[PDB]
């Protein structure tokens, strides 16, 4: 009965759901040689193997998750070439933006364990330190980082200056098919309009490029209810105050600006608000 890969059996007397998933996190790579030949004569298993380990993640707290994300990135330590396609597979589910399994809490502990990985060398620390610099930026359950927006008009405001039990930040490009879904799909959520007429929510769009012109012609898409400013100085852009790689993007801050959601989906801002209201 010898297989590419082995999941450990989970014993009966663990009858506690809590328990199961538990076990099944931490012991998930207990049958995997990480100094093995299985990352080229077998890449279509190992990264099922991977997608299938980010799955069962979701189902324990945050703080054992991000444990075991870290021992496993220790663990491929034993050979470069095993680490550099594991920390791979990690960009390429839980950082890129075209990811629907993207989860920058399970990410952070990757960049974590290679900025202190014995076998990359100084060049190859660069882009982790960089991304764990910028994840901790707008990072979840920390205050969002202040800027000065300017409206049509040239009338200028900061994000701190306005005061709602929430904010929700709407990071939009003009033109772009992706940023007229999500106009839509905030338009369409029927939490979003009540909040906004009560004045317990504030929509602040930002456009943080250049093309200033295509702003101005595309503006009209954009509701009168919300606040929608553009980036001067473009200061966001320059000093990377929030992560572009993904346009559009949306935040839901608390009273203080704390994060709530970050790089979250309409239905995921939606349905937090009507739990919460």
């Not at 663990?75 to 990690?90: C, M, P």
């Not at 295509?214 to 320059?238: C, Q, S, V």
Request: with cysteine; aromatic share 10%.
């Amino acid at each position: 009965t010898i297989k590419t890969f082995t999941l450990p059996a989970i014993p009966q007397i663990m009858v506690a759901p809590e328990q199961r998933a538990e076990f099944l996190v931490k012991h998930y790579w207990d049958n995997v040689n990480f100094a093995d030949t299985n990352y080229i004569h077998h890449p279509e298993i190992t990264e099922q193997a991977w997608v299938d380990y980010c799955d069962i993640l979701n189902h324990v707290p945050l703080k054992t998750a991000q444990e075991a994300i870290r021992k496993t990135i220790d663990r491929t330590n034993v050979d470069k070439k095993v680490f550099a396609y594991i920390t791979d597979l990690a960009d390429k589910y839980l950082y890129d933006p075209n990811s629907p399994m993207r989860n920058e809490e399970f990410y952070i502990p990757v960049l974590e364990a290679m900025a202190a990985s014995p076998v990359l060398e100084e060049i190859e620390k660069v882009r982790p330190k960089a991304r764990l610099e910028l994840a901790q930026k707008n990072r979840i359950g920390t205050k969002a980082i202040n800027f000065t927006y300017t409206l049509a008009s040239g009338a200028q405001g900061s994000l701190y200056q306005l005061n709602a039990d929430y904010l929700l930040l709407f990071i939009n490009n003009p033109g772009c098919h992706a940023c007229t879904e999500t106009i839509e799909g905030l338009k369409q959520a029927p939490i979003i309009s009540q909040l906004i007429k009560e004045k317990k929510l504030i929509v602040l769009s930002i456009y943080p490029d250049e093309e200033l012109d295509d702003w101005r012609k595309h503006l009209n898409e954009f509701p009168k209810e919300w606040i929608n400013g553009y980036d001067k100085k473009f200061t966001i852009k320059e000093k990377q105050l929030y992560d572009l790689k993904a346009i559009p993007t949306l935040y839901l801050l608390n009273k203080e600006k704390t994060v709530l959601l970050k790089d979250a989906t309409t239905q995921a801002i939606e349905e937090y608000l009507m739990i919460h209201q």
